[PDB]
């Protein structure tokens, strides 16, 4: 129900306090989907990395309100999930034990990759760095393909 129709319900109490900040993410998403034309391929990936970052940050905002500091009502938080201001499944992954700093949900899907393993942003930094120091070259992973995630491990 992201569009507001007759079937929608009116908002609970605290939403008008947090309406402006969410509004920022809305207008910033309407810069990201706006078709800036780029010739390159990496520079056309930068746009999708920006969109996935904005979606992640809006979901972190609603998560850090309801779960960490308990600042909004449960009756409002169910409305924000219903009206798709938040990703229910990504927050469900944030509530787990090994996953808290998780970028997106394509970096833990085992079926998508060539051989089993998740995306390389899920690795801790120090383990990659000790393997790269053992082979002696350097650690060559700057930024992920799916999200643009730069080390979204729980310790990092």
């Amino acid at each position: 129900p992201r569009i507001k129709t007759r079937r929608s319900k009116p908002a609970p109490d605290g939403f008008e306090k947090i309406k402006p900040t969410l509004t920022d993410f809305e207008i910033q998403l309407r810069d990201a989907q706006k078709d800036k034309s780029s010739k390159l391929a990496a520079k056309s990936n930068e746009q999708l990395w920006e969109i996935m970052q904005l979606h992640h940050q809006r979901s972190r905002y609603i998560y850090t309100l309801y779960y960490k500091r308990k600042a909004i009502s449960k009756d409002l938080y169910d409305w924000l999930i219903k009206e798709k201001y938040a990703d229910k499944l990504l927050i469900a992954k944030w509530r787990k034990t090994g996953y808290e700093k998780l970028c997106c949900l394509r970096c833990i899907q085992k079926n998508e990759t060539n051989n089993g393993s998740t995306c390389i942003c899920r690795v801790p930094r120090a383990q990659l760095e000790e393997e790269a120091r053992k082979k002696g070259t350097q650690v060559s992973f700057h930024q992920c393909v799916h999200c643009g995630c730069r080390g979204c491990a729980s310790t990092d």
């Binding site: 990395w49 970052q53 992640h56 940050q57 972190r60 700093k101 970028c103 942003c121 930094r125 120090a126 700057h142 999200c147 643009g148 995630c149 730069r150 080390g151 979204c152 310790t155 990092d156």
Partner: peptide, 26 residues
């Protein structure tokens, strides 16, 4: 083989609060 204080010490050197912050230097 790292300590829990040293992980936070390296992590505060990292730019850009979320995961999208670099380990690079600029």
């Amino acid at each position: 083989h790292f300590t829990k204080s040293e992980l936070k010490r390296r992590r505060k050197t990292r730019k850009g609060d979320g995961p999208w912050g670099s380990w690079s230097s600029s």
